[PDB]
């Protein structure tokens, strides 16, 4: 989030446990990121029988954070941890077929919205 090289939990059915970020995308000489950013991410703790496999490299967006999301009105929406949605590296859009837990307004942006057709909480 404020730091780079960090573990994030999965929010979609493509894998399991944790995955690690390697960079934030958009802007330059950069280090700070949030739920509105795309990140580049690696497969660490997911099972190889899933949609993902060990040591593979994807894109993602963050969907929950322990710092929270504040800008919709000026007061915080908060969560119990840091979690992300897994996307194709070349063309974006989600690789998951099912999402679990709540979502954000930023999750309704054109490059990510295909997995939230089921209209989850806080969309």
């Amino acid at each position: 989030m404020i730091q780079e090289q960090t573990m994030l939990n999965v929010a979609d059915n493509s894998g399991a446990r944790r995955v690690m970020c390697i960079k934030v995308l958009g802007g330059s000489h950069r280090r700070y990121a949030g739920v509105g950013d795309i990140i580049k991410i690696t497969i660490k703790e997911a099972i190889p029988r899933g949609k993902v496999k060990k040591g593979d490299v994807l894109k993602a967006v963050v969907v929950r954070t322990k710092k929270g999301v504040r800008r919709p009105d000026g007061s915080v929406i908060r969560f119990d941890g840091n979690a992300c949605v897994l996307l194709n590296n070349n063309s974006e859009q989600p690789i998951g077929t099912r999402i679990f837990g709540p979502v954000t307004r930023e999750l309704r942006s054109e490059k990510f919205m295909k997995i939230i057709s089921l209209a989850p909480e806080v969309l």
Binding site: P72, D73, S75
Partner: protein, 209 residues
């Protein structure tokens, strides 16, 4: 032509017409008077000399009091002056309270900031901190190196170092005007303004590039 004098009197956060929050600073602005207007021998053009506040005048000197007696026995607090051109401003009390900046969309508020004791030093200069472990000696916030070599054999002129604050004039420019109310001294501007509650300022039209 002129600015308008005021004071920072509070800061808050209020609702828009669509109900989301917007931050605002409350400014008291004081009603405009003109003490004389000056001849072309001063400034290079005409000039206009102005007052807004008043006080009990126990600590006001006769050099100042005879001038406020000339200006209609106003018992004035502060005295300011600007260039005059094209406009026909009056030589006496104009009583403009907010109306100079009621229709102007943004303002270039010149604040006076707040006193901070030491704030000519270190925190002023965003210097990278120094470690409490990894062997590091006698340092936590200090700059470390401050210059080049024996060849120039000097610290550079104007370089960052220690000093008192003692307060200073500052203009951030183009704050949005949210609300005004005449004869009740109200000017409301978006976001923060330089200085504390009780700090003096002058309001200007938007003049950025």
């Amino acid at each position: 032509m002129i600015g308008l004098v005021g004071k920072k009197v509070g800061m808050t956060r209020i609702f828009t017409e669509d109900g989301v929050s917007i931050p605002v600073t409350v400014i008291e602005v004081e009603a405009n008077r003109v003490t004389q207007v000056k001849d072309l021998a001063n400034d290079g053009y005409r000039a206009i000399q102005v007052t807004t506040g008043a006080k009990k005048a126990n600590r006001v000197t006769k050099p100042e009091a005879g001038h406020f007696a000339k200006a209609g026995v106003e018992a004035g607090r502060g005295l300011w002056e600007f260039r005059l051109a094209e406009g026909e401003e009056f030589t006496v009390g104009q009583s403009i309270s907010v109306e100079l900046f009621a229709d102007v969309k943004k303002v270039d508020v010149t604040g006076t900031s707040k006193g901070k004791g030491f704030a000519g030093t270190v925190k002023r200069w965003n210097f990278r901190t120094q470690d409490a472990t990894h062997g590091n000696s006698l340092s936590h916030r200090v700059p470390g190196s401050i210059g080049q070599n024996q060849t120039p054999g000097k610290v550079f002129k104007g370089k960052k170092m220690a000093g008192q604050m003692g307060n200073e004039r500052v203009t951030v420019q183009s704050l949005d005007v949210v609300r005004v109310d005449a004869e009740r001294n109200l000017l409301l501007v978006k976001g923060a303004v330089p200085g504390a509650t009780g700090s003096d300022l002058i309001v200007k039209p938007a003049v950025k590039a």
